[PDB]
Amino acid sequence: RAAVFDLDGVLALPAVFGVLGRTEEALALPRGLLNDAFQKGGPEGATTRLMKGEITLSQWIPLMEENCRKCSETAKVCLPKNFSIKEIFDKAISARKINRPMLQAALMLRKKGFTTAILTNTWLDDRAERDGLAQLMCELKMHFDFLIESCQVGMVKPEPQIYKFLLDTLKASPSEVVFLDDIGANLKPARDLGMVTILVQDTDTALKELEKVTGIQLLNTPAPLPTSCNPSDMSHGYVTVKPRVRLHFVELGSGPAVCLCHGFPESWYSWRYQIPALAQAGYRVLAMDMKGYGESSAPPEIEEYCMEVLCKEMVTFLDKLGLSQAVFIGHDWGGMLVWYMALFYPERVRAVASLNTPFIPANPNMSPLESIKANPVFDYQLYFQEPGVAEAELEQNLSRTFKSLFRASDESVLSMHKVCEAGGLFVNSPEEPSLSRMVTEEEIQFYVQQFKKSGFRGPLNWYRNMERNWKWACKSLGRKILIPALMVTAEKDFVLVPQMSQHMEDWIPHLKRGHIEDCGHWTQMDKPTEVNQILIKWLDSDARN
Amino acid sequence: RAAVFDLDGVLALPAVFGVLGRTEEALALPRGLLNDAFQKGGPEGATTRLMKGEITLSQWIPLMEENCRKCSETAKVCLPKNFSIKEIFDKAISARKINRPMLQAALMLRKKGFTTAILTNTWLDDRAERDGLAQLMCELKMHFDFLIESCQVGMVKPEPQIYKFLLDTLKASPSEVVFLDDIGANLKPARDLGMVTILVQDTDTALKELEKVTGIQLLNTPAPLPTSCNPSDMSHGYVTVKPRVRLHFVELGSGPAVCLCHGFPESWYSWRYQIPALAQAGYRVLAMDMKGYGESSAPPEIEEYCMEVLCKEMVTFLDKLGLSQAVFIGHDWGGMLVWYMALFYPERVRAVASLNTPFIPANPNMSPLESIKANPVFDYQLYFQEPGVAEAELEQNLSRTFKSLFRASDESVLSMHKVCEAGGLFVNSPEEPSLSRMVTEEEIQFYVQQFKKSGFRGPLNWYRNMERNWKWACKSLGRKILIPALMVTAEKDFVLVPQMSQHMEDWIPHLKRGHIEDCGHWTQMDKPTEVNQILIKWLDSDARN
Numbered sequence A, B: 001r002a003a004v005f006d007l008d009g010v011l012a013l014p015a016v017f018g019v020l021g022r023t024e025e026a027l028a029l030p031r032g033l034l035n036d037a038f039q040k041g042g043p044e045g046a047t048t049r050l051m052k053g054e055i056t057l058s059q060w061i062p063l064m065e066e067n068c069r070k071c072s073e074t075a076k077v078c079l080p081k082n083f084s085i086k087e088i089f090d091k092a093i094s095a096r097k098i099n100r101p102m103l104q105a106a107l108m109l110r111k112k113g114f115t116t117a118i119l120t121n122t123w124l125d126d127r128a129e130r131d132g133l134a135q136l137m138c139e140l141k142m143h144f145d146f147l148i149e150s151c152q153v154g155m156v157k158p159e160p161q162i163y164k165f166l167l168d169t170l171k172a173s174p175s176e177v178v179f180l181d182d183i184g185a186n187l188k189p190a191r192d193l194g195m196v197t198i199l200v201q202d203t204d205t206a207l208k209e210l211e212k213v214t215g216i217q218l219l220n221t222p223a224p225l226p227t228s229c230n231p232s233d234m235s236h237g238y239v240t241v242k243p244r245v246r247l248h249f250v251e252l253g254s255g256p257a258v259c260l261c262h263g264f265p266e267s268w269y270s271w272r273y274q275i276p277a278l279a280q281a282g283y284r285v286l287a288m289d290m291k292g293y294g295e296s297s298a299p300p301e302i303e304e305y306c307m308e309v310l311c312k313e314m315v316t317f318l319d320k321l322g323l324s325q326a327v328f329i330g331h332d333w334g335g336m337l338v339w340y341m342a343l344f345y346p347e348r349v350r351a352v353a354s355l356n357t358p359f360i361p362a363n364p365n366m367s368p369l370e371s372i373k374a375n376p377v378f379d380y381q382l383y384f385q386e387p388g389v390a391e392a393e394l395e396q397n398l399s400r401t402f403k404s405l406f407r408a409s410d411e412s413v414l415s416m417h418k419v420c421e422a423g424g425l426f427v428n429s430p431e432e433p434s435l436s437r438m439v440t441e442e443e444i445q446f447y448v449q450q451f452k453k454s455g456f457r458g459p460l461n462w463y464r465n466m467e468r469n470w471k472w473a474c475k476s477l478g479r480k481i482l483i484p485a486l487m488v489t490a491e492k493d494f495v496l497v498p499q500m501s502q503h504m505e506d507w508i509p510h511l512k513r514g515h516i517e518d519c520g521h522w523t524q525m526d527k528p529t530e531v532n533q534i535l536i537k538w539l540d541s542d543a544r545n
């Protein structure tokens, strides 16, 4: 089973074709005058050549004007002064945006096994403002198995040849595929070939028919999760920051550089729901494997993971990439790292944002051990101190380790208080952990394979530089954070609790805030939609400026 | 032997300190009033704390104002209405630019074995416009073994402690290092420690002393080559564009995306002299290993290298990277590829530029073999047709192969006419080729190691799709290139000759041009300086728009 969608009038509205109507009604020109000069000559006509890839759009612009002159001459009328055909088409193409509900339908269909494809009559766009069209196509493109464009295949969609091409591309019998189009003429051939068709007038009715014939709930369906990341479809970057320390990252999009720093014990993949969203919002996302994780190097020495060397290496990372600046968004331990980036390298940080992780200034008086002991929820951090112990139980069963950890506010299974002395992190934890509703088995197996490379030594070493970090932090006790800064709290995070951030204003006067209801500690995958809304909104106003 | 440079007044002019003089003379304020409130309190003073990293610049701004008030109060004067200390420092820092001649000196010194370092009194810049300072520092940073900043080490350069730190960092005896500073006070301690010092008033005199004491020609020295690329200091990107085809690239800088496409038989490294330059000019450079080369996949099948699949894969490359558009700059075969990107995917090409490679439209009448036979200089292309033959002699001795090829206009050694029948490409070529003046032995060994991975099959396959490329090109015979386009010709390129481009205007009406004197076929490394000037100038006006 497969599904095929037209672009104009189906996956994109308002249909550009419907500008040759508006324009007439607006200029009070004779009904059809435009849509006639547009199709003048039929197959031999300029527009058909334009659509077959014989000529470019800019080449076509003049041809359409001559027709409009010769079309209004026979109709015995005359177009105004600065009647601009380019002007009309510019705002028409620009006005046309994605049909979100129709895209959802395609998504679900594909999610449930359908081969999806876009088949459109279109042109080679060489306009000065062609990038707008290319941006839309890229966004749509990614969601379909195939994109067949008339100007690329040299065929045009009324012609029966392109339909045989479609099926050949799809590897499917006509009877096996649905075909949606806003133009009836372009429906016949598919119908005649024996495949299901749907004249698309209003979107919801078409989806009714679609849902109707597919036996799949498409309409009124729940709000979907943001687009995720298939690891092997990603651009992977590698930078050596030191004799034998190499950092790995995934990169997507263009615009201001946004560096995403995950926490413990995670990876770049923990940003899977925001990487596409932020790129889409006009940003260049660099999602890190922090030192010790995934494809980044993982040196055994503890001091390799104190905040001073971690931050210095991040600075070197920008250096090697030719970046004077980046916005740093961190979560958990990454959030900690991000606050220190802000305090120690303001020149390098376009803006700082933390998820869950508050900024707590060091206490010059109390040892970082007294202070951490002074919090019952941080009992497992004393457990992490002795090298090898925590590694052993965390590395013993990887799938179990993550299935236990990566859980929602409710479905917890870990006794996080009284951990070390009562045994370990998984004292009375099932050795057969249920699958969280936040994660599929596949996503868990990704973290499993990642951690098979270096294990937990490196990650745990982040916990073993308390006295070093404390000494370093004490240097910044006279400083304030005065660059754009955003703190986001998660209600149900029971160790990185919202209340811990209550005093941050003192140190970060212009601090902007965000908060998420019923969100646990794994913010990115727990509430991806709201997370994306909050960061994208904050970037637009504080990062791009 | 080592060399140490101050920033302000030494590697950067005009000295920011010298704004507390200008400002006074401009506002007709009492001599010194500013430079006094600036240093008020000495060690305990705000500025010293600012320079030690105790406070940020923005924290310091208010402290300096109070002093100026209290400093003008004792002097019995009063500052004007909107006397803005921030305003003064903003334009001061912004006005300060690199001292090019002083940087050259550092470069040469380092090139000849010196350990170089910058030692400066500086601050943590949290200004809204801090990025300007960060950009300068990044550019300078890269050229030195070490960058020691007062606000980072908690020490300040008058203090003797920072000097011991400097030497410890340098691993050198005082007697072994030179130390240049514009402030005499900051010279004493180095002198007292026994190291050579140079009060820097005018740059040329300081360089006279420098050259004088180093025994190295630093002044009046020839124009240096552009900064190059150390492969292992680069950000390396990897994108899978197909089931088993992966593309490798090097990435540097931010701004509009610039995709550099090398020719035959080369690599990303062939852009080594422009990658840093273009990044510096405000662009995000993606230097490709084209399909078949270096760390990119090299499938054995010939059709894997026809222009249609090569271009489609480049399009996929943008897709995976989240790029709607890129400017495509090609040389040789890359230039060919770039013209087809423009003809077949205008939406994707911000702008097109070719080095040496003209745009010649296909001849619908003559076979691509007749046409290529019709040119004596293209005799070696018939030699490339039969699979295995050319691979064999090209792979037989890699160092020889490149040493023979990569040669300047003059120092040629290859009989390029009557090649196949008279034996091979290296018929009467020395098996012990001299080293070209364009290349060091090291750079040759880089290409050698790269080509040890896949050999020449893939590269040569670019030559084996003539009939396929011809058929594909014939589709575009009705089209014109109307996006920003630039053609650059090289006088002494005796196969890709300037005259071949003479008709391009017909197909590319708004075509901009460039030309290089006494430049051979290996344009990038032959005339890197002029190449950079031409592309950077064309990008600024046609790419950024």
Ligand SMILES: O=C(NCCC(c1ccccc1)c1ccccc1)c1cccnc1
Pocket: A263, A264, A265, A332, A333, A336, A357, A380, A405, A425, A493, A494, A495, A496, A521
């Ligand atoms: O320990 C930190 N984060 C780990 C938080 C995470 C967890 C993972 C494994 C074992 C124990 C805890 C967790 C899992 C479930 C619910 C809440 C938190 C930390 C420390 C300092 C600064 N920033 C972060």
Ligand SMILES: O=C(NCCC(c1ccccc1)c1ccccc1)c1cccnc1
Pocket: B263, B264, B265, B332, B333, B336, B357, B380, B405, B425, B493, B494, B495, B496, B521
């Ligand atoms: O053959 C092409 N370039 C190779 C040019 C290069 C060369 C390398 C090896 C063997 C033979 C020639 C060369 C070396 C020295 C001087 C001039 C050219 C070509 C073909 C079509 C389109 N664009 C480029």
